[PDB]
Design a protein around this ligand. Sequence first.
Ligand code: MG
Ligand code: ZN
Lengths: 1111, 158, 277, 94, 263, 104
Amino acid sequence: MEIKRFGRIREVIPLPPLTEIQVESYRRALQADVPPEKRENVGIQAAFRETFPIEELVLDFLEYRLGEPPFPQDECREKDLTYQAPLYARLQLIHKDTGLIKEDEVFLGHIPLMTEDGSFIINGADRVIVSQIHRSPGVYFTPDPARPGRYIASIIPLPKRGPWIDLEVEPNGVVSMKVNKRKFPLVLLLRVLGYDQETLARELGAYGELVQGLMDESVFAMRPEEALIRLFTLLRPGDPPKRDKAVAYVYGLIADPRRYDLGEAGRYKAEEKLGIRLSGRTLARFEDGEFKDEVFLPTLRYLFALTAGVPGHEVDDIDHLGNRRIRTVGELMTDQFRVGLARLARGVRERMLMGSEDSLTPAKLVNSRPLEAAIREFFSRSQLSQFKDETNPLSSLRHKRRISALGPGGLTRERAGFDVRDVHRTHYGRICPVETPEGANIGLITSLAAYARVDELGFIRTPYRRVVGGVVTDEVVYMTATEEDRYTIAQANTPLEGNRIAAERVVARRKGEPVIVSPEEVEFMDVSPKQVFSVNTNLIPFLEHDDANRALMGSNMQTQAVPLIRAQAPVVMTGLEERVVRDSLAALYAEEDGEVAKVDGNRIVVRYEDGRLVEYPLRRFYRSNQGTALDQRPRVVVGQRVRKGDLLADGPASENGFLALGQNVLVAIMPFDGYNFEDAIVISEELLKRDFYTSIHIERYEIEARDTKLGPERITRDIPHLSEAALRDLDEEGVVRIGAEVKPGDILVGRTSFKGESEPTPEERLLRSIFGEKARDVKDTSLRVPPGEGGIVVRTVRLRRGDPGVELKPGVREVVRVYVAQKRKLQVGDKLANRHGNKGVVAKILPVEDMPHLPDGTPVDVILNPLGVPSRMNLGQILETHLGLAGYFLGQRYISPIFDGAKEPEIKELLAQAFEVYFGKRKGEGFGVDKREVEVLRRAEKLGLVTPGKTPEEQLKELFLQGKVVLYDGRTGEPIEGPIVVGQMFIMKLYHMVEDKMHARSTGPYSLITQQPLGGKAQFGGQRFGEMEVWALEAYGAAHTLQEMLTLKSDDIEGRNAAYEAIIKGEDVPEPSVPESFRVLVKELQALALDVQTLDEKDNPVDIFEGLASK
Amino acid sequence: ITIGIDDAVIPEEKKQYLEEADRKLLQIEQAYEMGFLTDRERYDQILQLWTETTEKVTQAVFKNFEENYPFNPLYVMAQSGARGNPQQIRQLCGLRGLMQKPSGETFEVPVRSSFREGLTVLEYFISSHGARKGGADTALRTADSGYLTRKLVDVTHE
Amino acid sequence: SMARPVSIGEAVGIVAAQSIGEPGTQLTQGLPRVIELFEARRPKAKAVISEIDGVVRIEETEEKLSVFVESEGFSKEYKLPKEARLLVKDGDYVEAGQPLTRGAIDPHQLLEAKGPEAVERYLVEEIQKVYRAQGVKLHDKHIEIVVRQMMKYVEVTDPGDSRLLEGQVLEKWDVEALNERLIAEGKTPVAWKPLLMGVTKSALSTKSWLSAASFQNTTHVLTEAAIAGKKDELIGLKENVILGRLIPAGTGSDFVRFTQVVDQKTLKAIEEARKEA
Amino acid sequence: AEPGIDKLFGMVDSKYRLTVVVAKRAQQLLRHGFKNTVLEPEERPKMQTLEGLFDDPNAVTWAMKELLTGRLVFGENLVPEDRLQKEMERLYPV
Amino acid sequence: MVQVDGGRFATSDLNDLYRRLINRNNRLKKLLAQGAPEIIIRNEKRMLQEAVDALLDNGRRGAPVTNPGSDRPLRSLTDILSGKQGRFRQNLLGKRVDYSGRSVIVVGPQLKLHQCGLPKRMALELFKPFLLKKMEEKGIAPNVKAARRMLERQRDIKDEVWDALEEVIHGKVVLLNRAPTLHRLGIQAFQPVLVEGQSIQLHPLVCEAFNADFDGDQMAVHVPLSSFAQAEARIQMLSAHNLLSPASGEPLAKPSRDIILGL
Amino acid sequence: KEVRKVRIALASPEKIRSWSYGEVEKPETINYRTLKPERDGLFDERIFGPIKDYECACGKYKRQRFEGKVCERCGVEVTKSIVRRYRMGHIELATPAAHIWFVK
Ligand SMILES: [Mg+2]
Ligand SMILES: [Zn+2]
C-alpha cells in the first residue's frame, strides 16, 4: 500500500538505543566481563577499594568475580526467585608483624542481575529502578535572604558523605562557618589550616572592609592544635577535649576520604567554577597529623568578589540544569553496596577484637548477612524499586525511562513547593516539558527527552550541529546546559539551501532567549524538533494544534492501552512507530541472513547463511503483571528468504513492525440524542460483529497449604458435605482439569483443614443429625472464585516442598497457583480514548440500522460530541480526521512528523483526489444527485459554505474539500440538516473496566475484630462512608437514615440481627434503645477510673444497661 | 452541529494589526536607540501595545463572526454560553497573546499564531510554563479546600 | 432551596459551612487571604487607622512621614515610612476606624476603635469582595452566621459579686444571663469585655467537653476530659453523632419529635370513651 | 415528583412535621396491614402489572394519599399514645 | 484475643498489659507476705508504678514497652480512645456500611428527572431480603431457605423472580453519591428503573449538580431501610424537590451544553 | 426511659468494687491446647458470664427455662451471654498507685 511521507527536514543522526541508560549504567557498574587488573575505580571496584583494608591484624582486598545463576530467567520467574549471581572476593588477611598471610576466596552473597531488556526479576515479580535527580555536589553561591546586599556561600558534598557548609557574613564584618546547625568563626579554621594575619592581608587585601572585619588576633595567639581543642569544645560541648580526640574527630569529619567525599562531578564543577585544580575530593588533607589546603581561599575570594560586585562572579540557580544531576540505577546500587560494606566493616572491626590472633580464616572473619539484607531490602521495599508496569510495550518503555526527584535524599510531598514542579528555562531538549503525571505527583515525575544522553558525570547532554559561517556542518556535538549557555542556537525548522542557510533573519535562543539574529552569529543548530519531547509525546500527530493539557492526558493515556487480538496500526503515524517496536525487545528479528526453515505456533527454525540451524522458541500466551495476554504471533512462512533485521514474528500490540494499540475506525462528529452529552461516546454493533476491540486477560489465583499445630493441611478430592455434581471438574488429586469453564464461587482447589474444638449452634447441629449429613475430622479450606469473575482455566502450577530450588516461608508444605483467562468483548460502560486526549466512557451500543450512513450505504461506526473540543483547544484531531478520511477513500497510510508535517493545501489536494475516486465512481454506475442532498446543499449555501449558482457536483466538491459530507440518519431516512465532518480515527481502548470496579452487597461476612462489614471490592464488602457524607446528611437532617447508617448497616450486632429478622418477618424495622457505641464508650470510660453519669433532664440516674451486667 | 477546521476563520485584519504592532515596536526600539527612555518603560510600552492589539483582534474576530457567519458553530457555542469564553476563541483563531516566565515576568515577544495555523516549537515551549503552573495550582488546591470546609463545619456545628 | 420561610428545626450551620467551602476549590489574593480573614491574625500590609476623630495634619520630612489627627484637644501622632501609599490629605477631618494608608486592617485594632459591629461588617465586606472578585455568587447569610459564631466569647474583666474570677472567658449568653440574674438578686452585675478570638480557638474553647474532646489535640483535651468533673447537655450535633444518638435536627428536632397522628373515626370513638367516664 | 407536594407543603407549616407525620402513619398502616385505611377502593393506590391492577405495597404512597384527602387529624398531645395503641389494637386487630 | 486461620491469635495488647500487672502485683503480694529486705521492695514498687503507667499509657515515661522481639510499641487505653483511629474521632466519623454498591456511571437520556438506572445484578444483590420475603409471600418457594438456595444458582433465575423484584421496588428509593461530596447536593435520592449491562445510568440534568462527568468517574449507591428513612428520603432528598442552591438560590438543575445549544 | 444529660466525674474505689463483679488472679487468658478460658483469669466465664446462651459450663441447663441461678459446678449462671459486653472486674493493688494522667 502507499505509505506517504511529508516534511522538509532531513535529520542527520538516528535515535539512540532508547533503554541504553539503564543497561549502560548497570553494565558500567558491574564490569563482569573485564579481567580484574583493568577494573577501573568505579562502582563495585571503587567501593571495594575505598572500604578496604580493615584497620582494627590487617585484611585487604585483591579482586572479585561473579558466579552464575543456578537457574535461567524463565525458570527463575517460574519458581518465583531472584535472578542473581554470587559474588566472590579474593582476600589476604595479612598480619604486619608475623607475616601471616591467610589468603582465601570468600563468598559475599548474591547480586541481582539485570535482564536483557533492562528489568529485574525479584521473587518472580517484575520490577524496575527509576533514576533519581538531585542537586549536584560542589560549591554554589546564593543570595542571602536576610541580608539583601550579601550572599551565602554553600559547599555541598556527596549525599550521606557529610554535612553541608555555610559560609556566612556576620553583622560586623567577620565571616563565619555554619556546620551542623551551628555557627563558629572561620579564622579559627584558617589558623587550623595555617593562615595568619600575614596571609589573609597578603592575599585578600583587595577588600579589607570584610577582611579587616575578619581580622582578630586572639585566634592567632593560639596554635592550630589549641585552636583545634577550642573548636572541639565549640562543636562538641560537654566532652573531654583531648588533642588526640580532636585531631581524630575533625580528621574524620574534614580530612577523611572514607567517611567524607566531595563528589567527583562536584569536584569537577568546583574546578570549573573557581578555575583552580584540586588534588583530592575532600575538605582537608590529613598530613603530618595536621591538615593542609584544599579549596578555602579561592571560595573566600569569590565570595568577597561577588560581595564587591566584581564581574565574573555570579550566584547560581539551584534548579538550573547545570547544577542538578541525575543518579542512574548503578549509582544507587553502588551506594547501597557501600552502606552494606561499611556495615560489614564495623562488624569485622568488632570481630577483629575477639578470637585467637593466628587461627583465622578470613572466611571465618566475615558475615554475609548484613550486605545481602541491605541489597535485598533495597531491591524489595525501597521507594525507587518500582513494580514494573508491562501493560503495552510502550508503557514498559516509558516506565524504564522515568525520572523522579522523590525517594531517599529527595523531597517529601509536604515540603514540595512550586518551582520543584515548574519547568526550568533550560529543560529544552533535556526533559520533556509535557509528559508528567497529574495529581500530587505533577512536576516531579517525568521522563527523559528523546535525543538526550547522560554522561558519566550525571549531566544531561544534548546534540547540536555546529554552524560554521553561514554553513551548518554534518558533525554534531553533545553538550550540557552550561556549555549551551555561551552560544546562540537557531531552530531546526529554519530553511536551508544545502548547507547554506536559506533564511535571512533567523530566530534563535541566546541564553535560552528568543531573539532575531543575523545568520553569521549562528554557532549551533538543533537537530530535529523530535529532540524536544519524549517518545510518548512524539507519537501524537499534529501536536502543533493541541493544548498542553490534552496533550499531557493523551501522552499519558497511550500507556494505558490494551493489546487487541485483531490489532491495527494507525492510519496516521509519525514515523517513530518502528524504532520503538524494535528497541522494545518484544518482537523477533533475524540476526543473520538465510531461509525460513520451520514455521510452527511454538517455535521458528531458521537456516542461516552461516549454516547454523537456529530455533527461537515463542513465548506464547504470557500473563502480564496486570493480567494481559502476551504472545508472539509468527509472521513468515517456510521457504522465504530473510535479511539481517527482518521481522520474524509479531510481538504483542504490534503489526508488521509498526506499533498497534487501537483500531482505525470511521467516526463522525455530531451530537446524537443526548448520548454524547458530557464526553460519552456512542458506537455501532458492527465493531462487535467483526470482533473489534476485543481483549484477553489472564487472572492468576493462589492457595497455600502449610503445617498447622492443630493438624496440618492437605489438598484432596474430598471435603465435608460436597455433592459430586458440584465437583465434576477436578482431577484425582483435586485441582481442576485444564479446559473447564468456571462460574463465581466454584472450587478450584479442595484443601482440608484439621478442625479445632469449639461449639456449633444446637439447631443446625440438630439439622445435621436429622437430615443425614454428619461431619468429619476436617473442615473446608477450598479455593473458590471471587464473585463476578470467571472463565477458562488455562495453566496450573503445583509446587511442593521437597523439589529442587524451591524456597518458601517456613511451615508451607506446598502451594498451588492457577491461571484463569477470559476473552473480554466490548460492552456498555468501557472507557475509550484517542491520542489527543478526548477520552470518555462508551454509552449506548446501537443496532446498525439506527446509525447514520453515507450515500453509498457505508454506515458510520463511532459518534463524538463536538462540544468537548473548543474548551480544550485540541484541534489536531480534526486534521487527523481529514487525513483519515482521505486514507479511507484511497487505501493508504501517511507519516506526518512532529511540527513538520502536512499543512492544509496538501490535505486539500489529497481530498480532491479522494473526492474524485469517490464521486466519479458512484456516478459511474448511473446514480446522479438526490433530492435530499439538493435540499441540504441549498440550505448550506444559505450559511456561506459554498458559493451559490454552481452545479450540485461542484458544491459537493467544495464541501469535500471542506471535509464535510452529507449524511442520512438511519432511524428516519431524511438527511441531517447540515454537512457533518467524518473520517477515520485511530482509537485505543483503556485498561480499566468495570470488572474490578462493580460490586454490591446486601449482607454477608463481618469483621472478626470490629464487627464491621468488610472492605475492598475484592472482599465482598461495602463502601467507605466519609465524614463529608455525614455532613451532607445532617444538612438534610434525615436523622433516622443517619442513625440506621451508623449502627444497623454497620458494626452493631443486635440491631442488624433484629433488622434482618424483622425484614424476613416482613414488618418495619424498629428503633434501638441504648446505643451500642454509647454503651461501649461508657464502659471504656469506667475502665479509665472515671464515672460517667448518664442523666435524664431531672437528674435521675437512668440506667442504659437495664441491669444486665450490673450487680 | 459539527466542527470543521475551516470553521476557525482567520480575519484578514490580524496581519494588518500585526504590521502596525511591528512598526510601533520598531519605533519603540528606535526611541531606545537614542536613549530617550529606559528599557523598563520600553518593556512596559511593549506590554501595553501587545495587550491593546490583542483586544483589537478579538473584537475583529467577533464582529467578523457576527457579520459573515452567524451560524458558525464556534461562535454559536460562544454566544450560547454552553462552552467557551472569548479568550479560547481568540486562541483558536487570533493569537495566543503573551506568556510569562516561572518568575512571573512576561516575555517581550508574543505568540504570533493560533492553534489553527500551527505553532513554532519555541512558542509551545513558552506556553508549557503557564500550563504547568495551572495544573500544579489545581492539584495543590483540592486538599486545602476540603481542609477549610472541615475547620468551618467544626466551628459552626451547632 | 425552597423560596419560602425556613422550616423550624433546620440545621443552618452545616449548610452554611458547606456553601462557604464549596467554591473554595475555584480560588487561585485568594484562599490564603480568606484563611487570614478567618484567622483574624496579623496581616502583611498592616495599615493604620484612626482611633480618635480629628483633622489630618501631615508632616513630610524627606526621610519621615508623620501624621497628626487633631481634635479639639487630642493630637495623636502616627509615624509612617515613605512607601506608605496614603488614603487622605492634609486638612482632612476623618473618623475613627477609617484607615490612613493602603493595605489591610488587623481586626483587633478595629475592635478597639469601633467595637464589634464594624468588625463584623468589615469581615463580611472583605469576604464578599474576594468571592465576587472571583465571580462566585453567594448569599452573605452564611458568612454572617459564622462570624456571629466567631464573636461569641467574652472576657470577665472584673468579677464583682460573682462566684467567677477575673480574666475568665465564657459565652456572651452566660454572662448576660448571670448579670440579669444578679440585678434581679440585688447584687452587682459583672463587667465583661467583648473578645474576638480565632476560629480554631473558637472551636477549641467550647463548653461541650465531648465534642472538643473528640475534636483535636485529643491527648491533652482528653486530659481536660479527665480534668472536667462537669456535665454535658448534648446541644450540638457532633456529640450526638459520636454517641450515636438521634441528632436534634430535622426530624430529630424536639419541636416535632412527638407529633401524633390519628384518623377521624377511631379518634372520635376514643374521645367518646374518654368523656363517658 | 410526588404528587401534590406543593399542596402538601400547603398543609403543614413545617416540612419536618410532615415527614414525621407520614412516617408514623405508614408505621400504623404496616402494623395493621392496610385494613385500617380511610380511603376508598378507587382511592387505593393502584399498581399495574401484566396480571392486572393491585394495591400498592409501599405504605408511603398510601400515607401521602391519605394526607392529601384530609381525614387524618394530627398534632401534639391530642391523646396519650398508650390508650391510642390499646383501642387501636382492640378495634383493629390483625 | 481470637484465633486467626494461621493459628495465631489476633490479640489486643491490653491482655498482655493485664498479664504483666497481675504478675507483678501478685509477685509483690508474695514478697510482702514474707518480709523481704526493703531494697527489692522499693525496686518492685518502682516496677509496679511503671507497669500501671504502661497500662494507663504505654508511651509517656521512658521507653514505651513492647513485646520481646518487636520494635513496635503497644496500644494502651489512650491509644484506644485517642488518635485518628481511636474511638472518638474514627469509630463514629468515617466507617463502612452494608446494603451498598459501587459502579461507574453513564448517561441515560430517556429517564425522567427522579429516576436512575440500576443493573439487574446490582438490584438483585441489594434488595435480596425483600425479594426473599416476597418470594415466600408468593407461591414460588415455601420458606426463606428454599428461596435462598434457589437464588443461589444463576441458572434458576426464571421470569417470576424478576416480577417479584419489580414488585418490591415500587416506590422505593435509593441514594446516589459521588466522592468527594462538597455540598449537600452531593447525595441525592432517586427512584430506580432496571436496565441492562453493568453500569449505573443517570439523568443528564443532575450530573452538573454532582459536578460529575462521564470521563470514567465512579459512583456509590446506598439504600434506606426503615419506612421513616424512606419518607426522609422521598420528601427532602429527592432530586425533584431540590432545585435551588442552598448557597444563593439559583436553579442547579438548569439546562446544559447540548440542550442550550439546540434551543 | 431516655438520656438527656451526661455528667463526667471522678472515681471512687467503693464504686469501682460496685462495678466489679469480682477479682482477677491468673495471668492466663484461655488455653492453647484445649482453648478453654481458665478459671479466675482474664477470660474466666464465671465472672463475665458464659460464651453461649442459657448454658452453664458444667452442663446442668441448656434451655431458657431458668435464668440467673448460678450453677455451682462451674460457677457461671444461666443468662444471655451478651453481658460479656458490659461487665468489669477489678484488681486490688498491694499498694496505691497514681493515675498517671494527673501526673503526666
Ligand atoms: Mg472524572
Ligand atoms: Zn477456666
